[PDB]
Design a protein around this ligand. Structure first.
Ligand SMILES: [Mg+2]
Ligand SMILES: [Mg+2]
Ligand SMILES: [Mg+2]
Ligand SMILES: [Mg+2]
Ligand SMILES: [Mg+2]
Ligand SMILES: [Mg+2]
Ligand SMILES: [Mg+2]
Ligand SMILES: [Mg+2]
Ligand SMILES: [Mg+2]
Ligand SMILES: [Mg+2]
Ligand SMILES: [Mg+2]
Ligand SMILES: [Mg+2]
Ligand SMILES: [Mg+2]
Ligand SMILES: [Mg+2]
Ligand SMILES: [Mg+2]
Ligand SMILES: [Mg+2]
Ligand SMILES: [Mg+2]
Ligand SMILES: [Mg+2]
Lengths: 190, 139, 201, 56, 175
RNA sequence: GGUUGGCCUCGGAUAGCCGGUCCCCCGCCGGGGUCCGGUGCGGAGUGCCCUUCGUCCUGGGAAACGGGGCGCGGCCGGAG
RNA sequence: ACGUCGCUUUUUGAUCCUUCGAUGUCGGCUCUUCCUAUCAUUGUGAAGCAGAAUUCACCAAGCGUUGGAUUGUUCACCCA
RNA sequence: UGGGCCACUUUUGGUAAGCAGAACUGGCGCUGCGGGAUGAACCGAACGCCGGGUUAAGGCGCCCGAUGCCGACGCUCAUCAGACCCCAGAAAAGGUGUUGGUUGAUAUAGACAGCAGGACGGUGGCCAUGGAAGUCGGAAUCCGCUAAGGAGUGUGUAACAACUCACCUGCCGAAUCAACUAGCCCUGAAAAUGGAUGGCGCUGGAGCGUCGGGCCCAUACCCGGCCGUCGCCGGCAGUCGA
RNA sequence: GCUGGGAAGGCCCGGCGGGGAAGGUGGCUCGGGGGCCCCCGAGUGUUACAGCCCCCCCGGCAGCAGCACUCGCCGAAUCCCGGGGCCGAGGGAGCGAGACCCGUCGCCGCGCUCUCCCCCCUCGGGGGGGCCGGGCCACCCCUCCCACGGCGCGACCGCU
């Protein structure tokens, strides 16, 4: 079955403005700007409000699989709005039984050095995605903070660290050491 | 992004098929491939028509769906689509194509002579403009 | 026809374009296909790369030097596709194959000429927008072509020169429109004839 | 309802060739004088002729 | 049975009068067939299943094409049918939109072939009724019950791909 | 032995395009942002250009800052 | 387990289509290549995976898979 | 001549066999031709030497004649896709891939899903016992307060404890759930030289199913020419310009 | 030509109406919009500031498988004209003059003259109307038989 019309609307806050260039969305807010094109999805995007700033995604004559993309686009745009207004902050706790995992943060927070993971002498060097800043928290002991605007990049960097600290040739239900994402929140808490 | 829609009252130009070259109005929609179609002032009786042979125009009439041909014709004559259509750039491009197709040998000869003179004058003026614009002595 | 038919390979599907080109060169026409790295193949890239790797596997077990020759340039890949549709083991088919020239990028003979397009072979009309496709340039580069980078740089250089040429052409057309509105009293007599006979709406 | 009389005349055309024909079909076709493909003949319709047409 | 565009036939038949019952009952059927020859054949096929009748022991007293009463009115058709699959026999209810009953039945034959690989000899139409929009059940049909229906034609495919076969300009899709 | 006018070029998009114009930055031209048009492409390859009977009297228009030089000499661009 | 569905042609049968104006019939030695239904090695997933060891499974045939006593042996068995 | 063989269907022995043996008709043998890429037997059609027309079976992206139709409707994405009688490779069993269909159930007296509260008392019910308390087991399967709660769905303890369900309730505001069924696709699906829808390739189809209009060509059919054979036991002795 | 003596449809605002509703017009209510005035979305439902369907008490006009290309089967109920391609086999056809320069011949279909008037172009030629009586059908009157179909009225027979 081909549904005649499937549309979804997202609301844009006052402090953030959205510009459309075809299927390329530019979301500019107080924390910076974000670009993302959706040329891989055949939808129409329209800006409706001069007062309340609604963005509408319409898909005409779509089947099941391509009606599944309307809310995907809407959620991506909402994540863009969230990133440019509040930002994204992923906390990572480093857990270990015996050997403390020593994480040092190199230039501007874009490079992470894991030293003593499970007592190994190999030094893990993980480079964050551009626009992502890593730091060692002051409130908690074994905690890293990854902050950025693009949720894609922030969570990809968190996954890079988590998969860098991976146990080999051992029962992973017993050897639980590693750095794991503990919380996925925002910055500015608003 | 879309500016023209299939809707009740939308006037469509039939591009091919038995009724090619005519205007119709969409009266109803069936099964996403066809429409009930009625051109009462363009000599197209009511019938089903695939959307593939339609090219939507910019005119939209106002009548309810599956209204009778009397009301479709009244809506067509009020705000007469025939004259409005003839005035559009689309219709006169069609007209130019038709009268170029029916050009005779003598008309082709006369067109060749007129085009010859027109192009020579235009290119002389073009050369004049280029030479005039080439006098640039400025900091 | 009697002139050389130059086709731009960008955005065209491999087999569709090859069938059209093969019939043209069998009809005695000289065909030049440029930008063979812009040719597309339907189906996703991994699938098409697997097809080419299976082609690479077919070699003469006794002497691979005698075995099938796997050409890695996109132009040679397209040329071999056309040869598959020609009767290349006859003199007629070999003459047809000789009437075909294929290039990666657009060399200086044909970069100053207008390039044709075959709509019946174009990806935009022939392939559903929701379907995946592979680039012949990428596929060739990953099966062993060595000149993807240099062809890209030369193509961007050519595109810069073409942009300059287009700006000049637009300037000339603006000047022609200004001239047309300038000499109008002495032109409306012939303009009327053209409008009467359907040229010049 | 007016039911018209069952037709009394038929035109019969042999549409298949002469290769690999079973003996009964062959005999009936010879009796109908259709010994060639695209040979036609008129047949007066009754029970006897209709049951011959059913064979072929 | 093959196809084409189907037509509806009212076929009326009966058993031959015998010295047991002089006036046998008359039976009427709706047959969707390419032509009246096929219509008579299908009538005998169905009445042989229903009653104990045969072509030899009976006669067809009428066979006439039933013209659509409202071929200018869009309507919804519900079709009850039964068909043989590869592993069983099933009853189906299907819905179509058309201007003619025979056109909707043709749609049904095309659709059964497309979705179930069912051939016309397997399909067996047993009821066709013009239903109301409020009585429709299939969402594909029901999505056209919109008084203010409106949709564009998004991705227009170039169909004259060979007139011209070679051209400078790449085609436009948005219209 | 063929052949029986030429086309001297944007990049591309396709749920989008093309053209033009006023303000800002790039050393006088482009890139943006407005704004204005066109879009079954008409600034259109279904298109455009050239268009060949030749001369002689002989007027009006176009031009007259014009045409033709296998005439010389110089310069510039083009390397896939 | 009781059942049931397959695949393979490295077993042995079944058949007798080719060869009886002849296709040299076992094994070993030598040498190349191929297959994967993977023994090891690379990368992984699972466990009745604490570690070590082992077992099951996936991508996978790139590389390797040995020296000997007895026996014509193929097989077999043992030493290392 | 007295070696037969093959195919539809019937049919015996055998696990089966391109095995062995029967019945019926046709064929190959003895037979070319169009189609099945290829092929003794399949499909069409049987043949003197030619011209024109038209077909069969089969086809019409290119090889390669013909769809260069503005063909119709759907289905289908395959990191081993599929692609036409015989025929040249697959099964049981699976899939929350998608598409149709059947039957049933819940819901504005508030469904479903989520987040959020309660999930009691007799009673640690009886018999089993080393400990079995709702949860190793054997029967029973009740009652009260209730909005509701099994003398218990599962995790867990030696046993408790502690979680969790089915059961009710808050928020949320409109449709939702389940079991089947069968199309295409996927898993099942492993062999040896490198290789086969015939190849190239094809994914708004050059795939699959149902249909249309055109069009292509056989030694077949029709018209005509010419050769020969057979038949008319055909005509002519009337050369009878009288 | 036939059909359901086509089905639909067009026009006559179809008129007196009756009824049904919904893919719900106006209006009303609610919720989001453009400078208390103009839109979009959701509810009420029966004409309103649109329309649709059915029955009519009855329709009328034109057209008529339409030259407004919606959907057939046909031709004793069928004729005219045109275009492309391939072909030209045969060779004594005279019953008549008694053939004589080569049978422009048979069957078939026609025209004119051996009758006389007219009419129209043309300078004798060309083109037209015919030229008297019969039937048969068309129109009016009333008139017989038969066939087929329907309806009614009996009389007989059979069957509750
Ligand atoms: Mg969310
Ligand atoms: Mg271990
Ligand atoms: Mg046969
Ligand atoms: Mg020898
Ligand atoms: Mg030898
Ligand atoms: Mg394996
Ligand atoms: Mg046998
Ligand atoms: Mg023999
Ligand atoms: Mg014989
Ligand atoms: Mg034969
Ligand atoms: Mg053959
Ligand atoms: Mg085959
Ligand atoms: Mg022939
Ligand atoms: Mg073929
Ligand atoms: Mg061809
Ligand atoms: Mg498979
Ligand atoms: Mg007619
Ligand atoms: Mg002759």
């Amino acid at each position: 079955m081909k549904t005649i019309l499937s549309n979804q609307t997202v609301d844009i806050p006052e402090n953030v403005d959205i510009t459309l260039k075809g299927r390329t969305v530019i979301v500019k807010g107080p924390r910076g700007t974000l670009r993302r094109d959706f040329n891989h999805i055949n939808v129409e995007l329209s800006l409706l409000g001069k007062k309340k700033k609604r963005l509408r995604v319409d898909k005409w004559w779509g089947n099941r699989k391509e009606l599944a993309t309307v809310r995907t686009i809407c959620s991506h745009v909402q994540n863009m709005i969230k990133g440019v207004t509040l930002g994204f902050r992923y906390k990572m706790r480093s857990v270990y039984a015996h050997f403390p995992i020593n994480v040092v943060i190199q230039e501007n927070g874009s490079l992470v050095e894991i030293r003593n993971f499970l007592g190994e002498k190999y030094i893990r060097r993980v480079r964050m995605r551009p626009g992502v800043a890593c730091s060692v928290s002051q409130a908690q002991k074994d905690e890293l903070i990854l902050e950025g605007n693009d949720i894609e990049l922030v969570s990809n960097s968190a996954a890079l660290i988590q998969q860098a600290t991976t146990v080999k040739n051992k029962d992973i239900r017993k050897f639980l050491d590693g750095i794991y994402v503990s919380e996925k929140g925002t910055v500015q808490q608003a | 992004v879309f500016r023209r829609f299939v809707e009740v009252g939308r006037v469509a130009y039939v591009s091919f098929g038995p009724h090619a070259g005519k205007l119709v109005a969409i009266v109803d929609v069936i099964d996403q491939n066809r429409a009930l179609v009625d051109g009462p002032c363009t000599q197209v009786r009511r019938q089903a028509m695939p959307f593939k042979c339609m090219q939507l125009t910019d005119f939209i009439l106002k009548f309810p769906h599956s209204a009778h041909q009397k009301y479709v014709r009244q809506a067509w004559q009020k705000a007469d689509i025939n004259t409005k259509w003839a005035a559009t750039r689309w219709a006169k491009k069609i007209e130019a194509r038709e009268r170029k197709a029916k050009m005779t040998d003598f008309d082709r000869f006369k067109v060749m002579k007129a085009k010859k003179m027109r192009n020579r004058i235009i290119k002389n003026e073009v050369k004049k403009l280029q030479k005039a614009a080439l006098l640039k002595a400025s900091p | 026809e009697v002139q050389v038919l130059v086709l731009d390979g960008r955005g065209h599907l491999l087999g569709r374009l090859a069938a059209i080109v093969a019939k043209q060169v069998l009809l005695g026409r000289k065909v030049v296909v440029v930008r063979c790295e812009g040719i597309n193949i339907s189906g996703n890239f991994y699938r098409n790369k697997l097809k080419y790797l299976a082609f690479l596997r077919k070699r003469m077990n006794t002497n691979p030097s005698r075995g099938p020759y796997h050409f890695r340039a996109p132009s040679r890949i397209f040329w071999r596709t056309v040869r598959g549709m020609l009767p290349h083991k006859t003199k007629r088919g070999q003459a047809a194959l000789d009437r075909l020239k294929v290039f990666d990028g657009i060399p200086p003979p044909y970069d100053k000429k207008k390039r044709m397009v075959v709509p019946a072979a174009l990806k935009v009309v022939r392939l559903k927008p929701t379907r995946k496709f592979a680039y012949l340039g990428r596929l060739a580069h990953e099966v062993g072509w060595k000149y993807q980078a240099v062809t890209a740089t030369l193509e961007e250089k050519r595109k810069e020169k073409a942009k300059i040429h287009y700006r000049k052409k637009k300037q000339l057309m603006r000047l022609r429109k200004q001239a047309e509105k300038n000499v109008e009293k002495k032109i409306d007599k012939y303009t009327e004839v053209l409008k009467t006979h359907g040229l010049l709406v | 309802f007016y039911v018209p009389a069952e037709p009394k005349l038929a035109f019969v055309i042999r549409i298949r060739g002469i290769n690999g024909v079973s003996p009964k079909v062959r005999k009936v076709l010879q009796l109908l004088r259709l010994r060639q493909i695209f040979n036609g003949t008129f047949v007066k319709l009754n029970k006897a002729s209709i049951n011959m047409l059913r064979i072929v | 049975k093959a196809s084409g565009t189907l037509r509806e036939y009212k076929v009326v038949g009966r058993c031959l009068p015998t010295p047991k019952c002089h006036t046998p009952p008359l039976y009427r059927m709706r047959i969707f067939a390419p032509n009246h020859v096929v219509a008579k054949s299908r009538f005998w096929y169905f009445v042989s299943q229903l009653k104990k009748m045969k072509k030899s022991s009976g006669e067809i007293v009428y066979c006439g094409q039933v013209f659509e009463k409202s071929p200018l009115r869009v309507k919804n058709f519900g079709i009850w049918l039964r068909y043989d699959s590869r592993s069983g026999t099933h009853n189906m209810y299907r819905e179509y939109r058309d201007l003619t009953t025979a056109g909707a039945v043709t749609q049904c034959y095309r659709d059964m072939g497309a979705r179930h690989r069912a051939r016309a000899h397997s399909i067996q139409i047993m009821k066709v009724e013009e239903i109301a929009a409020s009585k429709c059940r299939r969402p594909a049909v029901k999505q056209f019950h919109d008084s203010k229906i409106k949709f564009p034609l998004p991705h227009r495919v170039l169909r004259r791909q060979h007139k011209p076969r070679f051209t400078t300009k790449r085609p436009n899709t948005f219209f």
